[PDB]
């Protein structure tokens, strides 16, 4: 799984910082080692190193052997799940967040919907009117990224999709290696 080593490296580089990554580079080698040997090689501080390993343990990137004496090894395949969860993450972003049909009162900066128009309208003025602060409501472009900002994030997402494509292709071949 030489390609898997690059995909893992890629993913670590974009996500976690270099303090994690240097230890992570050794973990990428994947071998059963003792904390002391890993401490001698790295010369990191024991406390921060344990913070890193535990954060990784939280990721389930790591597995252990309890001899007490403790030894650490890489669980490898927390990768398929990691890819999948990220896609949902990327997708939720791709899911619409802009409440369409959607008026707001520029005075109270609160939000209301299309349905709330049928109750916030007043016939005496022939226009809409907020509840607790009687003022005309307009648009919605607040807190939720503007129409032109929407385009910028949707394109950014659209730009994100290809750059993780090869990784999926790596994953596709890895999953084929797991069919066998």
């Amino acid at each position: 799984p030489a390609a898997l080593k690059r995909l893992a490296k890629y993913v670590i580089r974009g996500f976690y910082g270099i303090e994690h990554a240097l230890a992570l580079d050794i973990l990428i080698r994947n071998s059963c080692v003792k904390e002391e040997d890993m401490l001698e090689l790295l010369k990191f501080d024991r406390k921060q190193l344990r913070s890193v390993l535990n954060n990784l343990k939280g990721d389930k990137f790591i597995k252990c052997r309890m001899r007490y004496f403790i030894n650490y090894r890489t669980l490898v395949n927390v990768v398929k799940y990691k890819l999948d969860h990220m896609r949902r993450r990327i997708e939720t972003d791709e899911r619409d967040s802009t409440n369409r049909a959607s008026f707001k009162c520029p005075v109270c900066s609160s939000t209301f919907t299309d349905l709330e128009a049928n109750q916030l309208f007043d016939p005496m003025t022939g226009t809409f009117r907020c509840t607790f602060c009687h003022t005309e409501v307009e648009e919605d472009e607040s807190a939720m990224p503007k129409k032109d900002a929407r385009t910028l994030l949707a394109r950014f997402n659209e730009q994100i999709e290809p750059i993780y494509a090869l990784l999926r292709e790596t994953e596709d071949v890895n999953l084929a290696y797991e069919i066998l």
């Binding site: 690059r6 490296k9 890629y10 993913v11 580089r13 974009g14 996500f15 270099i18 303090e19 240097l22 050794i26 080698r29 071998s31 090689l41 790295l42 010369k43 990191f44 501080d45 921060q48 939280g58 990721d59 389930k60 398929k80 799940y81 990691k82 999948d84 969860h85 990220m86 949902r88 993450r89 972003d93 950014f156 730009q159 994100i160 750059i163 993780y164 990784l167």
Partner: protein
């Protein structure tokens, strides 16, 4: 012993100066201002400090190069790094600067080529290291990344199950 340390320190400075030319004991006594240390101590030096010395370099019939013995190539560990199993070597910044030339001048060019600095020998202390493939997605990155620490929160073989269905 103290006197011997002054020999070590002098020699250390001379190595640091860039030279490893050997000298006679007498000259070293003189340059360390320890000429009148006496026959006895000199003899102790000759029959322990200079011969029982685990890393003394004898060359040209004279004693040289005491501070160091582990590294002589004075260059990046290309051979050490090339290996896929024995790769490595986080090293002290002060060790690299002492070995030959100050790091900082090569580093300013190196900082976007072959060297990486991490704060680790205390936050003031610095370790030298290196890199390889790009980042994955342009983005604010730190904001998305901080919403992506997965869920190291259980029922996760079941969250992939749920996610597949």
């Amino acid at each position: 012993f103290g006197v011997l340390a002054k020999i070590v320190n002098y020699m250390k400075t001379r190595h640091q100066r860039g030279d490893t030319h050997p000298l006679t004991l007498d000259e070293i006594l003189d340059e360390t201002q320890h000429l009148d240390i006496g026959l006895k101590q000199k003899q102790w030096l000759m029959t322990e400090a200079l011969v029982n010395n685990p890393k003394i370099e004898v060359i040209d019939g004279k004693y040289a190069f005491k501070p160091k013995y582990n590294v002589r190539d004075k260059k990046a560990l290309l051979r050490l790094l090339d290996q896929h199993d024995q790769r490595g070597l986080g090293g002290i910044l002060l060790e690299d600067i002492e070995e030959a030339l100050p790091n900082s001048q090569k580093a300013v060019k190196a900082l976007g080529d072959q060297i990486l600095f991490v704060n680790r020998p205390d936050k003031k202390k610095i370790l030298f290291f290196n890199d390889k493939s790009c980042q994955f997605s342009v983005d604010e990155e730190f904001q998305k990344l901080w919403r992506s620490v997965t869920v190291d929160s259980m029922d996760e073989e079941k969250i992939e199950e749920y996610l597949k269905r």
